[PDB]
Amino acid sequence: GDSDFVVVANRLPIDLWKRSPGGLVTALEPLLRRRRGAWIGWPGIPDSDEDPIVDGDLVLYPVRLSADDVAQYYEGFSNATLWPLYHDVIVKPIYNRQWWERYVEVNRRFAEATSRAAARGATVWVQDYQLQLVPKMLRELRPDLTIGFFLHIPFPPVELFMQLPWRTEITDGLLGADLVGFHLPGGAQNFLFLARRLVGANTSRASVGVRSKFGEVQIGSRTVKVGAFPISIDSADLDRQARQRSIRQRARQIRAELGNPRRILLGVDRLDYTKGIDVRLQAFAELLAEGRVNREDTVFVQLATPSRERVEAYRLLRDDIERQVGHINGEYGEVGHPVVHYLHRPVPREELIAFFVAADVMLVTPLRDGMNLVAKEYVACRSDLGGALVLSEFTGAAAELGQAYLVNPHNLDHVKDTMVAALNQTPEEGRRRMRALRRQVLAHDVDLWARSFLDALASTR
Amino acid sequence: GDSDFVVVANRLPIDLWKRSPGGLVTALEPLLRRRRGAWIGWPGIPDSDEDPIVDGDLVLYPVRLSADDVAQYYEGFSNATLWPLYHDVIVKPIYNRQWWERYVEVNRRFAEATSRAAARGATVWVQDYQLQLVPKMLRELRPDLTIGFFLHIPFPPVELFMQLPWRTEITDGLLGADLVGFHLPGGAQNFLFLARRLVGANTSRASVGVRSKFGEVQIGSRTVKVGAFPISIDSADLDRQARQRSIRQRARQIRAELGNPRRILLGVDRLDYTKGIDVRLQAFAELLAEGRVNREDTVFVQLATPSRERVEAYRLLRDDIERQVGHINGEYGEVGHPVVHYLHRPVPREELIAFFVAADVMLVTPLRDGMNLVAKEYVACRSDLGGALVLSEFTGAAAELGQAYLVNPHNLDHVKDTMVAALNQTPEEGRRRMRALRRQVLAHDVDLWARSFLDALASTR
Amino acid sequence: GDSDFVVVANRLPIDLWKRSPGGLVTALEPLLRRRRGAWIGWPGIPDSDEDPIVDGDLVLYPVRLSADDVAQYYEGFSNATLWPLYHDVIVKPIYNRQWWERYVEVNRRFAEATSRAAARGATVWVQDYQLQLVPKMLRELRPDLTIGFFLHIPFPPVELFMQLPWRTEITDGLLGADLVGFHLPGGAQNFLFLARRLVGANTSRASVGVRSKFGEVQIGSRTVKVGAFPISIDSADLDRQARQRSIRQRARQIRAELGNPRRILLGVDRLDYTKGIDVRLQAFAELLAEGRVNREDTVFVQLATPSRERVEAYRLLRDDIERQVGHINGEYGEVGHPVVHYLHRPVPREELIAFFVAADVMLVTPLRDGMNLVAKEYVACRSDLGGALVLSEFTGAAAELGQAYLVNPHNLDHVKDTMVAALNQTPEEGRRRMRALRRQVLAHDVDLWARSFLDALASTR
Amino acid sequence: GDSDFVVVANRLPIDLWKRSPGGLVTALEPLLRRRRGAWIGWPGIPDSDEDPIVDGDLVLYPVRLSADDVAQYYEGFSNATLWPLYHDVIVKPIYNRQWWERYVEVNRRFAEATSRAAARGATVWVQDYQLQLVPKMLRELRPDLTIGFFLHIPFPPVELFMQLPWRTEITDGLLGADLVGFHLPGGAQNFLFLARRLVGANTSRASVGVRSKFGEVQIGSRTVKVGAFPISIDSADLDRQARQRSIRQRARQIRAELGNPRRILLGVDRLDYTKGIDVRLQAFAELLAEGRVNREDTVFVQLATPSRERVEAYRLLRDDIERQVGHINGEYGEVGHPVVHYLHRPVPREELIAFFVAADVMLVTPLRDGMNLVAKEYVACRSDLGGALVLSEFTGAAAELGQAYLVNPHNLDHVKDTMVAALNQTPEEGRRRMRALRRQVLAHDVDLWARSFLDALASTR
């Protein structure tokens, strides 16, 4: 092809077709202004053409997938084998050979599309868990390419990873890259250990730094760089948007519609068993029972965005959460006044930002999360320095957002203590924490993340 | 004893101790003003004295029961064997011999207390399913007594009744009475058939009338009268109470607190799997999904009063209903505006009456109910002739309240159609139905019921 | 058509194609030798021709059904709505309007095939629950026809039947017949009461006799005869077959393969939740635990024939029974010697008969069964007068086989007592019972049943 | 006290009281012949005296525990918090603060008993997961003592360990020892990493060897040694016992009682969800369905010894396994001939050894196991060099028994392939593997293990 910079991801950065706002595609904008860039991904419609589509500063290469392909490669292998395994087997992974075989076939198809688009000596950046075979497949097809890979979800400990019948094929797949990145040093170090134990490769033994002090795996003639690059958001843009009059007006209206509570707790999550929504609800219920939260002036809003309905674990999870909601309101609410407001639906960006601005306490309590950008978005939105962030230790975000109220979500007593603390914090203490969190998030944004990964990758040449 | 009229019931008509208002004890007030009356029952506290307590127009004879007695006779046999069996095995009855043995022991203890209180030739009125052995036991102890029995729950068809390992002992128990009454002719006719089939007794073969045309079972020397007497409420008193200023003011306030909806649907039930609460919620959810009910101006309030928490079926039922509530609000509500308000708690009388007055549509959809007084209470409260009653055919009330919107709760399509019809009825049609329902309920009150049963019983002398 | 006697049933009396042995088609053989007979039914293959097929003493009229037709009319309405409802809602019926609509369509299609085959003034005999609309539909199409209907499953009490949203359509459907027959007077009497209550028809009020003392329903100009005709088997043929040398040799071999136990208990059932297989296993387990059955010389063989695998209730039931089997053997067996032998597969006729001959105790403990021919087959096979029959009261068979050891399957204590009694009966007592049972079964065979129904039907002319 | 060598373990090495044979107490016999030894542990009876009991070469110090103590410290914290967590959360750990508090109290009580028994400068060896706080508690009470700790179960990866609300207290507890040992280098390395990450201690960074190349944790003034010492059995004694005439005769009798199968597969396990019994049964069932195992000449015997019945996970597991057994026999067995023989009961040593000798294929397929001595016992018993060992990679045993047929139990396709391979191996290949396995197990016995740990501990002085 004629592209010297190519992004490979499960989906094209579009929706219907119009280019999707924000995210990775926006972070890379100034690079695309200096490169001949291309994006390889599934257009999100079944059995479509693979004809390249010129869309501004990108050429888009659509990967043809059937509904059956999506069911077995994505809904299957990716979301019901890899996802639960990598997230500390919160639910039991399903090991299915037909899913594996389709995952291989689809990965090869992404690899072929990438080669089709990539010019000689081009830099290629492959994204996430659904495409872990692509780097090896691409290097075999195109040994001239410089290949980076970034995993957006946790990389599990070796004791769990080893369950995968195709553990070696996945590992070799990743080792096809010149640079393998994770959010956290822990993931990088697990990968180094896996390389030694499973593949018998020689690796570096030192701790892995943040955006520095990289690890190495020796694979015959070449070296694989291994690093930690924690993702972030466009902090400055969110900070700007949350200041808009219409957003502030909507935040006031939200509080009014809730019957002007003294305190609003807020949860915002893609519905997933990794997110610890059940833990929040349990803690809230027990605090109400104990009279430690005032049922007359405190309300919990949980916004769950629909996710992966075709996967049974997610339907069962939705059932459990919805029971908790009904139960808590039946026990502690009044007619015309729930203590929990729960919505299961997509939330427009402007509405989400209004909720961040309205919320006195942000509850981000995942059991295991790669990063969790919601936590960072909340911080960026609170330029008024109001609010409080309650944050699980088991998110990548906790390594950076140490001034938040950190919790072990498995320690329910301390989750409860912490929610009371956040709800009753002095104005000054809340400001101290939020100022410190904002200093971190404003300085460590998605631009820094992307430049750091690309600088590390370029250095492998 | 020195009492010539004795009521026997599971519980004394008191609570703490102060005499409980309304109900059977109030209906019998003018009779107690002319008789030396007594009431035999468990005082509701474990291991208490059985010393007679003079309380105004009654002498109270407390029956001593241990917590273990209550667990096996009441929670066990009564509520987990007899209750589900008599209500068309909506859940599976548990047949347990230890429960049976305790049920026999406790019944004998009620019988002994009754004899202790009853003067020679006294009239005795035994109440309900928990005490079905008492009439036979009492006749053996005291053949001088005139004994009536009234079953407040349905009497099941013979095909189901026959499951009971102690079917014959229960039947003989009832046949100890001079008069056996049920709400409905159907129950009386089942009893007649059971007597012939199981006990081989000679009975009348004709249809049984309402408060007339009684059936007969020949038991050796004596005849057992069998009748249908549908219970009711103190219609005039409720009609009066619902007109009070404070009640009307509270009804307006309820509508205001719900965000002034155009239409309020109301369910009020003791939480029980017989009540068809799940059916209401399913119908409401599907109407919302279909856009046949407006989620912006219509709200459903369900008031569930706690019941029988020590029985697993009831805890499981509560879980299912609470899931439906959470689910429906998550799907169709807005923050600050649920489409379903659900409370699980006792409701004070004045509050309940305010809800009846506020409610545009009363949803009474049991799978199987002896009578259902909530339906009649709603009618009595609507002297403004507003509102609409949606009523299951499978309640005793449906035989009298034919002008309501009757439904087969198993026919979900028609339940849905009917809820739309009730919600959108013309003012005139609603008034026509409510006027007709009130004529019935005002004329057929608990006084008529009690006099009719007692006249039938007295006639057996 | 040219047929003056027509049988209508869900399936043709064939299999692949060769004519199926025994059953109704064999019972009617001497009638077919004097009539121009035809059989209407589904050939058991999807989307086949409806071309008449001359097969000896019958003309076969195949009804075309799609796999979707079978799924919704048969697997759906028939087996998941009607079957559980008619059998005392042992599992919850599913009420589904699409299933109903297909059931109507298919019934009409059977009606049209029947008219196609039937000559003027022909006698038509419609069979079973899957075809309850046919008599009315046929009378409308062909008012010249004489129509009989026989229900092979129980007819439920009115309190349960009334759940059916299409209760009236089913009842009108049956009332299209000149004669409606059931195994038992109880079913006939339920039908009479249903006719009065639901349809408001004038009926006879007397008890219904066995093959006599028929009931009547007046339907405008015409009268519907209602009767009880308990089905049976070809007793003499089974008696003859069980005497064959090869059968007796196989029975000895069975005992040898079981390690020559002193006592063999046997269950033989189509796998169904109506059959009470779980109750047998529970009783056996508790007797072993109590040391009341000797685990060293007593063995239980349960033969379950596969049934209705596409219906979830049946898969769940299979799971429960299979757990009980594993559990009991794990607790009381030895390596090389189970106390329970369980097979889930079809059993050839000759093998079944060998098991009847080998079995010391036949366990037939259904919760609810129309008749249960297995009980009668066992009796007919025991010309040696050995063995013992333990029989649920809730089978139609119990009305005739009173000399068996009758049990209420809900009374587990008495089921256990009875199994011990049957296992330890004196030789003389066992012979007394078996002689008496055989006298009944040899005299009341399928020939008597069929002649009695056809005589009653002919009499309606 | 007067003891210079003290073993601390959850239970005393006795049963009723007579001293229990084999195990750790027998391995230490020659050391006790040269030391003044004592054993601290719960005598296995509730609320007993703590009076020292002289029993030969040991003084026994009984720890008083109530039934409530056992319920919360052992059944609770140990078996329902720590056990599932350490075994890769195969089931969800329960985090309960009351259990934790009792675990602390009981550990302190073991510590106090130990100090009571231990002379100045005595060597103390604490055993297993139930007593992880003892080393720290003991060092505080008795800083003169030399303390070793050996964990008999896996030490989990840090990502899972960190879930424990009391993670730091457990880690500090272990760090109270002079020597911390695990079966495997993996456990030692997890512990080293945990020490750095959670406790911030300076550790060695190198790989940990087997019985060599020890790790170190620096804790202020002192160093903690960390090592891997894989436990084993008394190989020579088992080898001798399996040669006894009566054992060989019983093995022949077992095959005869199974109907002289060509091949016997054997599973022997304490019933536990870690053991992968469900996987064996699934593989066997699918091989039968596929016709890859001959249902006429191949049989599977599973011996499950009862374990932890008071823990719900274990009762649920038993239910699942027992269903599989019933199902497989129903599908593939014949009357008088199951394909699976399953016993749930304790098995006497001599009987177990006879089964090892009879078994053609030993199936040891745990999901996660510290070591698994059953695998080694089988090997030691096969001096005839017959048999085959199918062994999960996820057992500590797999690191030593590499010549067995190793499987990933999550890779069901390969488990199935491997069972066919083991069943059909040539005599020569089977002998080659068994000879090699025996060389390892005969040379690496429990004596070597115990001397190696004690030499390492002594070296810390």
Side-chain angles (χ1 to χ4, degrees), chain D residues 354-388:
Chain D
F355 271 100
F356 288 148
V357 171
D360 301 287
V361 178
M362 186 74 223
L363 298 174
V364 185
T365 67
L367 304 177
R368 178 59 77 192
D369 212 340
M371 182 52 64
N372 194 289
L373 294 183
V374 165
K376 298 195 179 188
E377 289 176 327
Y378 178 72
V379 167
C381 288
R382 305 311 300 259
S383 56
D384 58 300
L385 304 177

Side-chain angles (χ1 to χ4, degrees), chain D residues 309-359:
Chain D
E309 184 272 343
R310 296 163 160 127
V311 178
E312 188 181 19
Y314 287 77
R315 301 196 301 274
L316 295 175
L317 169 77
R318 187 191 179 180
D319 289 347
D320 293 335
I321 288 166
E322 286 172 354
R323 199 274 309 170
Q324 286 180 283
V325 171
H327 174 80
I328 293 166
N329 284 325
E331 192 63 38
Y332 306 108
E334 302 285 346
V335 171
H337 194 96
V339 285
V340 176
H341 293 262
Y342 164 80
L343 294 187
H344 181 261
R345 72 189 61 157
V347 190
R349 273 302 275 198
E350 289 191 73
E351 179 80 340
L352 176 55
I353 298 168
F355 271 100
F356 288 148
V357 171

Side-chain angles (χ1 to χ4, degrees), chain D residues 112-119 121-217 219-224 226-244 246-251 253-290:
Chain D
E112 296 166 353
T114 298
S115 174
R116 223 147 52 226
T123 291
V124 177
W125 190 356
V126 185
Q127 311 294 322
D128 234 356
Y129 75 105
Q130 315 91 335
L131 296 175
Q132 294 179 89
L133 301 175
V134 177
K136 175 192 176 79
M137 287 169 172
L138 186 56
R139 183 169 303 276
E140 291 173 342
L141 289 174
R142 294 283 310 270
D144 65 284
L145 292 184
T146 287
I147 302 173
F149 181 91
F150 187 88
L151 190 72
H152 291 260
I153 64 170
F155 198 67
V158 173
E159 284 87 348
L160 294 178
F161 186 88
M162 288 289 196
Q163 294 186 14
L164 196 61
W166 309 280
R167 56 198 183 199
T168 281
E169 288 73 18
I170 293 294
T171 306
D172 281 333
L174 295 169
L175 289 169
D178 292 291
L179 167 63
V180 183
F182 306 85
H183 296 291
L184 295 182
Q189 288 156 189
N190 285 347
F191 183 68
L192 291 179
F193 178 43
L194 177 64
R196 293 194 303 277
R197 180 96 160 112
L198 182 56
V199 174
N202 287 328
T203 75
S204 54
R205 312 299 291 263
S207 285
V208 172
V210 170
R211 297 180 300 267
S212 59
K213 208 194 172 196
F214 303 112
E216 294 189 8
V217 178
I219 300 298
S221 35
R222 55 180 192 91
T223 299
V224 180
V226 184
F229 315 87
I231 207 159
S232 187
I233 62 171
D234 191 341
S235 310
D237 174 83
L238 245 197
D239 176 77
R240 188 214 69 244
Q241 192 167 7
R243 294 171 196 261
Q244 293 181 7
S246 65
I247 301 285
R248 288 171 174 167
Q249 293 179 303
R250 177 62 182 147
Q253 182 179 70
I254 287 170
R255 305 198 59 111
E257 286 163 354
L258 291 168
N260 290 296
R262 193 180 70 87
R263 290 291 181 266
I264 296 170
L265 301 104
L266 176 68
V268 176
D269 320 76
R270 191 183 46 82
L271 191 44
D272 201 305
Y273 47 80
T274 63
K275 299 299 180 172
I277 297 160
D278 41 5
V279 172
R280 294 164 213 180
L281 287 164
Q282 189 68 35
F284 193 53
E286 295 189 5
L287 288 167
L288 287 163
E290 290 160 16

